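Retro notes, item 3 of 5
We never archived the inputs for the NAP complex last cycle. Fixing that now. Sequence and ligand:
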Amino acid sequence: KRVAFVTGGMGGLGAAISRRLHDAGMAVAVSHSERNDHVSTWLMHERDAGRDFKAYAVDVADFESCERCAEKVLADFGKVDVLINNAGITRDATFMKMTKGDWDAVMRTDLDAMFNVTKQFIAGMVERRFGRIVNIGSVNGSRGAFGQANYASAKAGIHGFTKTLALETAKRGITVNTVSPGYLATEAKILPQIPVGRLGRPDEVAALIAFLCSDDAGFVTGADLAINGGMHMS
Amino acid sequence: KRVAFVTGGMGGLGAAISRRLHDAGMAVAVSHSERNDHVSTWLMHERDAGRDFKAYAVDVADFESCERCAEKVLADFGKVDVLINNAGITRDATFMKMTKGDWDAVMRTDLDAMFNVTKQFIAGMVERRFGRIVNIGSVNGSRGAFGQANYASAKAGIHGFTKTLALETAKRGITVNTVSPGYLATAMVEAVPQDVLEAKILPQIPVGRLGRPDEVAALIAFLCSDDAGFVTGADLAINGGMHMS
Amino acid sequence: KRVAFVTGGMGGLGAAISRRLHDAGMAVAVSHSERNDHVSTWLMHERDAGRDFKAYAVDVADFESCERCAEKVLADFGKVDVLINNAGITRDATFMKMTKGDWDAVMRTDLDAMFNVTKQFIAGMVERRFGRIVNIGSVNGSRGAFGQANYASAKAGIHGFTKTLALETAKRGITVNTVSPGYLATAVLEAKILPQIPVGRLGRPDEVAALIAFLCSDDAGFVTGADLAINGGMHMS
Amino acid sequence: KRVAFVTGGMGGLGAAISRRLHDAGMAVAVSHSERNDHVSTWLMHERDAGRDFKAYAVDVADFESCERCAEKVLADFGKVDVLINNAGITRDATFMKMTKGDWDAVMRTDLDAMFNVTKQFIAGMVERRFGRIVNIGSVNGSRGAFGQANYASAKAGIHGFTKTLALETAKRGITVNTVSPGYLATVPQDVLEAKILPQIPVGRLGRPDEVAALIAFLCSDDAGFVTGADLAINGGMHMS
Ligand SMILES: NC(=O)c1ccc[n+]([C@@H]2O[C@H](COP(=O)([O-])OP(=O)(O)OC[C@H]3O[C@@H](n4cnc5c(N)ncnc54)[C@H](OP(=O)(O)O)[C@@H]3O)[C@@H](O)[C@H]2O)c1
Ligand SMILES: NC(=O)c1ccc[n+]([C@@H]2O[C@H](COP(=O)([O-])OP(=O)(O)OC[C@H]3O[C@@H](n4cnc5c(N)ncnc54)[C@H](OP(=O)(O)O)[C@@H]3O)[C@@H](O)[C@H]2O)c1
Ligand SMILES: NC(=O)c1ccc[n+]([C@@H]2O[C@H](COP(=O)([O-])OP(=O)(O)OC[C@H]3O[C@@H](n4cnc5c(N)ncnc54)[C@H](OP(=O)(O)O)[C@@H]3O)[C@@H](O)[C@H]2O)c1
Ligand SMILES: NC(=O)c1ccc[n+]([C@@H]2O[C@H](COP(=O)([O-])OP(=O)(O)OC[C@H]3O[C@@H](n4cnc5c(N)ncnc54)[C@H](OP(=O)(O)O)[C@@H]3O)[C@@H](O)[C@H]2O)c1
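Structure as it came back at the time:
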């Protein structure tokens, strides 16, 4: 049985990913933040809907926290085959008004997490000669993003990580890809810039991610998969 | 019942696409070239494997041939919901040695087909407010390739077409995407000398193997599904790590 | 003394390119279309402003025409070191309404020119181990554009050509690059075009020509196979 | 008289940039690292070569250091029109062997610098309605970079910053661009010959002065319509 770990797995996109991977037959572990005030509630509602998840506290901005979390996940599941680096935040401000704290918080959570989280699971994937690592970027890592110098930098940086790790793991049965969603239903200045004329559904993005985590996607690696309603093309 | 039309549907990649779309529950029409000498045999083997396809002659480089083909497809199936522009050829030569015929043949088959084929089915998709158009590009459109000034140009041009048509159709429930494969296990690869396969082709591919047509077909089947309506104007790279950007 | 040949050298962008290359010290030849009705007027006014150009008729959509043109250029200048594939047209229509003639006209002029024109000058560049080939694309090849299924495809295809020819010529001292301008002040802008341009103005042909002059210089030999975007921020990726 | 500030202005690429901008007629200030032990000698040699530079200590990974540096630069020159974010380092390791220290050192120097340095100069450029901000990326922010998960992430992140700042400043006569050099003649010969040069179509390393010449064009009055762009100068090593 394939094991998936989804950071931010109780958030808007993360919950959709977790449900799709569970329905594809994977055993699914989710992370939750230290500040999360609804861990037991979320698990109960998912169980009522027919899905048993296990949850693990983590601060993806903190390497030692990721170590403690990974120890628990691996103790319970024995391995992680599929890693979704989905946790993320924004701290929007014009560059002129942006604080060092705004910058750092986004950098540490959205980009350092690539190192902090993936370091804990990569050795096992390499040892077993199988893995799927999916890093959640953003259309605003590609298009210019007003008021988001920190978020755009972190999200663009994610794809540099994806490409390096893809090259390093390509002969070990692992793929590493970036999925860059557009704006999700999770907005009178946004909708006009989306050609399909609607926000994206988290379940749609989750469906693409489930394909990438499947046995049919072993030839997709180092790629950036854009699912943005046409908002950005290049 | 969703209807798909796959150009080059009996070729290496096209056959894999046709099978995947059929297995997803679509009614599948395939094109074949006018001089294809094995059409009945191909249909019989697919029937033996449990899949009934209907096959239609076309020259995708010729607008009138595409018109005649589409007339017959629509007479049998009533509509086309899913169009896979997959037919394609190469005519490799260094630019110094490339002929006018080499250039025109690749441009007309590989790029003009975007116009010649898609024009025959776009109106119905627009009126029904649903469609999936998938154009097969190439990793060599993205990175360029020695000996392929014609082919890389045509394959790069395909994505310009994809982006424009995506913009024009986005409010009609249609998506238009480019799929750009790396080297695949088909006949083009199988005609390569073994030493060239080993020393020149495989070292280009980080995952260390050619891609299977069925893998590319699986990605295309996702794009043609009801879960991919938010993917449009994209270029989806499935190349084993051969190219990243 | 480097020789440049600029197709569409008398048009909006082409004239600015020709002036910049001349001012960089090159001997400049320009093409003109077969029915251009102001060739001698243009040449005289450029001479009045201090620049002696020579002009040559061509149809870049026709291989034979390009043969004849290159024959005349090479007879007068001896060689061509720098080739600017700048001639281009649009034939806008929604895809639903676009005709085969709309498609073919843009494809043959804008994309086939890569073959028809460059085939006539590539051998000399390879023989001399020096060359600069600059192909004019468009921001609309990068982002796609309503009504331009033909033009966006042709302009996107140009960069596929650039990358391949760059690979084939890189060990022979030749560079091949695409320059993709945004909307230019050439011959409703406040409501339709300008709001899409972050810098809030159209581009000047001379600005694009200045970038091209850099790419054609001895300082740009490490730029090849690139697509240089000069679009006022209209498209980023 | 246009004023330029070049971080890492005494390094391999940075010195070539500083010379080109000086020769274009700009007044040029360069940064140096805090423990750079050859500031006086470097300045003297440039002076003997006919170029008067002013040098300033900074740690681009530290916001307060950037503040002190910028205040002294602005006191001496009155303004900065042209900012070259060129300081940078590598800490190469395979991902399996890479430490948090390797990652943080590259992130803070190569990516946080975009914030730490540019924050000190942006207000003046906005007020004067002129600016050129050029951020030095890398071909390895575009192509896959084996053994450089940290450096590739930092360099790719730079272009996200470029594009945002380009959008926010475009109406104020400021351009912001990424320049992404390939491998430069600034490593064992066996690695150069087996791993690097075969992947560069032109078959040679780039010269720092070549990259500096492109940067000089981008900082000129002819480049005001180039913004939010990534300008690749890599010998053909990466195309897309
Ligand atoms: N929403 C969109 O339109 C959109 C578009 C493109 C990309 N994205 C990306 O999609 C991802 C998911 O975001 P979302 O839209 O689902 O927003 P969301 O509902 O706010 O979810 C963000 C998730 O991040 C987790 N998280 C944040 N900081 C964390 C930390 N330090 N340690 C551990 N977990 C942390 C949260 O955990 P808890 O729930 O446990 O507190 C939460 O589940 C993000 O990477 C975002 O950048 C979103
Ligand atoms: N193979 C790879 O490594 C690779 C990699 C990237 C992209 N691609 C693309 O994948 C697509 C399919 O190629 P393939 O590898 O499957 O090669 P293939 O086996 O040679 O198939 C090419 C197909 O094109 C059809 N065709 C060619 N010219 C035609 C014309 N004028 N009118 C109608 N049909 C025509 C052929 O039809 P008949 O069989 O009926 O004669 C054939 O089915 C092409 O677009 C190719 O560029 C291939
Ligand atoms: N203007 C913009 O906003 C813009 C933006 C991006 C890209 N571009 C590109 O810039 C280039 C120059 O166009 P422009 O803006 O300067 O427009 P333009 O003034 O209309 O110039 C087009 C040029 O193409 C030449 N030409 C057209 N068809 C030809 C043919 N079959 N054979 C030979 N010459 C032919 C014309 O020659 P004659 O003058 O001799 O008749 C003319 O000089 C084009 O490639 C265009 O796509 C323009
Ligand atoms: N060399 C290449 O092949 C190549 C290719 C692509 C991109 N690049 C980029 O080009 C830029 C310049 O590097 P280079 O090739 O010239 O290498 P270099 O000779 O090692 O110079 C790096 C520069 O960074 C400065 N620096 C490092 N950490 C600093 C800090 N914390 N605070 C202040 N200054 C600091 C150094 O200052 P001091 O000299 O004062 O100590 C030095 O001038 C870097 O961004 C690099 O990533 C280089």
